[PDB]
Write a protein that binds this ligand. Structure first.
Ligand SMILES: CN(C)c1ccc(N(Cc2ccccc2)C(=O)Cn2nnc3ccccc32)cc1
Ligand SMILES: CN(C)c1ccc(N(Cc2ccccc2)C(=O)Cn2nnc3ccccc32)cc1
Lengths: 304, 304
C-alpha cells in the first residue's frame, strides 16, 4: 500500500546523457546509437534568442564547433543536421549504453519521467504530465535544456520530450525527439502565453481509484451521475470533458474496486462542489491529475 | 524555475539490485562488493512472521538455500551471517557495478530516494522522508522488501534504508544497512502502531523559501515572531519544535531571498492559523515537509 508520484528508474537514460557546447552555450544532449540530439538553440547566444534565424545561424557552424563530451571524454562530430527544432549531431562512436528505444509524441494528459541534467550530468528525476495547454510544470534551471522526458516499457525507453524553454509564467515548453514542439510554442523569446491549464479528469478519476485501493475511502458517496451531467460540472471547474473512451480506459480500475466509473464521477462531482473540507486524499489536499489509469495499475501491481 | 519532488538519479542503485529467494519467500537484495544485504525475514514463511525466532529459523538454512540472482544469472553464496535484522550473504563475485558507497543512519526529517523493486528489478523511484515517528510513507507492495533508500553526493551513494514491513495503518518500517530498525519497530507481525506523525517544521520553512525563489510569494506577510512564540503555535498544530540549529541551517536560504528566518516563521504561523483559503503554494494545497533545506538549495542550484 501507499501511492507516490513515482518516476521510472533512470539508469537507462543516464547512460545516454552528454554535454553539448556550441560557442558559449552549453546544454545537454541525448546520445542514442551514433547520433546526439539536442535543442537547436545551442547555436544561439542569449541575444540571438530574441529573433533567431536558425538556418542562417547554423550556416556559420561546422562539425568542429559542436563540442560533445560524454563523461570526461570527447566525441568526434562527423555530421550535423537540423530537424525542426532539434540538431542531430552524428558522432563517430555508437553509444555503447544505448538502450532499446522509440521516439514517441505523447498526447496531453499523458505522463512521463524527466531526468533533469546540467553539463551532461543527471541531477534528479521527477514525474510530470503533458498539460492540456501543451506545457509541462517541471523543475528546470538555466543549463537544463536538452534534458529528456521518457517512459519505459520493461527494457524499451520511449523518449517523448526534450526541454527547450521556460515561459514567463514559470511553465515549460519543449519538443518531441523529432524536434516538433508540443503545442504552439516556438524557440523564440517573444510573447508566448499558455492557454488554460485545465485538469486531466481521467487522471483524477484514476487517482481516486488508487485512493480507494490504498484505503482512502472517505470521499465515496451514495450518488451516481451521467457523462453529460458530470461534464456540465467539470466544464464549470476547468476540467477536461470526460469521454466514453476515458470511461473504457478506467474499466480495469472500476473492476478492481467494484466502483462503477460513473459512481466515482459522482464522488468527484461532490469533491469539486463541496471541496475537501480540510481533509486529504493520498496525502494531498487537492485532486491530483498527473497519474494516468495505466500509471495507477502499474504502481498498484508492481510492474518492473 | 519550478519545484518538484525530485528523486536522485537511480542508475547507480539499479546496478546493485538482485533477487533473493529463500524457500518460498522472494524479495530484493542490495549487492555491494561481494556481499548481498537483504531483510532477515527472507527465511520466514507468512506464518513464521507471527512469532519468529530468527536465530532458530536461520539454523535450518545453509548457503545453498539462499538463491541470489543478478539479472538472469545466479550468484554463488559462499557465506551467510545475520547482523541485527539483515542478512549478509557473501557471494564469490564482487559486483562489478558497485558504486562508491557508505552506510548511513539518517535522523527524522531527513529525506532520501527509494528505488522500489520486485524480483530484483526496479519498478520506480520516488522521494520520501524519515518521519518524526520513524515510519516512512512509501509505495511498497508484497515483494518490495529489500528495496533501499539512499542519497547521492556526486558519485558516492549513502544507503540509509532497507524496506522491511508495512504496518496496519499503511505506513512503512525498515532498517538502516546495519540491520537496525528506524524507531521501535520490529520484524514481528504483532501490535505495532506508529506515534504522532508530526510535521517537519524546518522542512516546511525550506519549502516556503523554495516557493519564494520560484515566484509564489502570496503568503509573505508583514509580521515577524520569536522562536518561542512560533513554537507555541507549532506545538498546537503538531509541528516539530523549531530550534536555533534549524534557524542556522536555513541561513543560506534566508540570505538568498532576503527573508529573515523568523519572518518566514511568522508567515508559516499565519498559514497554520488562517489556512490556505483555497490557494496553493508550489502546486500544493498543504504545507510540504519532505524537502530539507539542503534539497531546496540543491534543486535550486542544479547540483549534479
Ligand atoms: C541559447 N541560449 C543562450 C538560451 C538562453 C535562454 C533561453 N531561454 C529563454 C527563452 C524563453 C522562451 C523562448 C525562447 C527563449 C530559456 O527559457 C531556456 N531555459 N529553459 N528552461 C529554463 C529555466 C530557467 C532559465 C532558463 C531556461 C533559451 C536559450
Ligand atoms: C517473510 N514474509 C513471507 C513476509 C510476509 C509478510 C510480511 N509483512 C507483514 C508484517 C507486518 C509487520 C511486521 C511484520 C510482518 C509485511 O508487511 C511485508 N511487506 N512490506 N511491505 C509490504 C507492502 C504490502 C504488503 C506486504 C508488505 C513480511 C514478511
Amino acid at each position: 500500500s501507499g501511492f507516490r508520484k513515482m518516476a521510472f528508474p533512470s539508469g537507462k537514460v543516464e547512460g545516454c546523457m552528454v554535454q553539448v557546447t556550441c560557442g558559449t552555450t552549453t546544454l545537454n544532449g541525448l546520445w542514442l546509437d551514433d547520433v546526439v540530439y539536442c535543442p537547436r538553440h545551442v547555436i544561439c547566444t542569449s541575444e540571438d534568442m530574441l529573433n533567431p534565424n536558425y538556418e542562417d545561424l547554423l550556416i556559420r557552424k561546422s562539425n568542429h564547433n559542436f563540442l560533445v563530451q560524454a563523461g570526461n571524454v570527447q566525441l568526434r562530430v562527423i555530421g550535423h543536421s537540423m530537424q525542426n527544432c532539434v540538431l542531430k549531431l552524428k558522432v563517430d562512436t555508437a553509444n555503447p549504453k544505448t538502450p532499446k528505444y522509440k521516439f514517441v509524441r505523447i498526447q496531453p494528459g499523458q505522463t512521463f519521467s524527466v531526468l533533469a541534467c546540467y553539463n551532461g550530468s543527471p541531477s534528479g528525476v521527477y514525474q510530470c504530465a503533458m498539460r492540456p495547454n501543451f506545457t509541462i510544470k517541471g523543475s528546470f534551471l538555466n543549463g537544463s535544456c536538452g534534458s529528456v522526458g521518457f517512459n519505459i516499457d520493461y527494457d524499451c525507453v520511449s523518449f517523448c520530450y526534450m526541454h527547450h524553454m521556460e515561459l514567463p509564467t514559470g511553465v515549460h515548453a519543449g519538443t518531441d525527439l523529432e524536434g516538433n514542439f508540443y503545442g504552439p510554442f516556438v524557440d523564440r523569446q517573444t510573447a508566448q502565453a499558455a492557454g488554460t491549464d485545465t485538469t486531466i479528469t481521467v487522471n483524477v478519476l484514476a487517482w481516486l481509484y488508487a485512493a480507494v485501493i490504498n484505503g482512502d475511502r472517505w470521499f465515496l458517496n451514495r450518488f451516481t451521475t451521467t457523462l453529460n451531467d458530470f461534464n456540465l460540472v467539470a466544464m464549470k471547474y476547468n476540467y477536461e470533458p470526460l469521454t466514453q473512451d476515458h470511461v473504457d480506459i478506467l474499466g480495469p480500475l472500476s473492476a478492481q474496486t467494484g466502483i462503477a466509473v460513473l459512481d466515482m464521477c459522482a464522488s468527484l462531482k461532490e469533491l469539486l462542489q463541496n471541496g475537501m473540507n480540510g481533509r486529504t486524499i493520498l496525502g494531498s489536499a487537492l485532486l491530483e491529475d498527473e497519474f494516468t489509469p495505466f500509471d495507477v495499475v502499474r504502481q498498484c501491481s508492481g510492474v518492473t
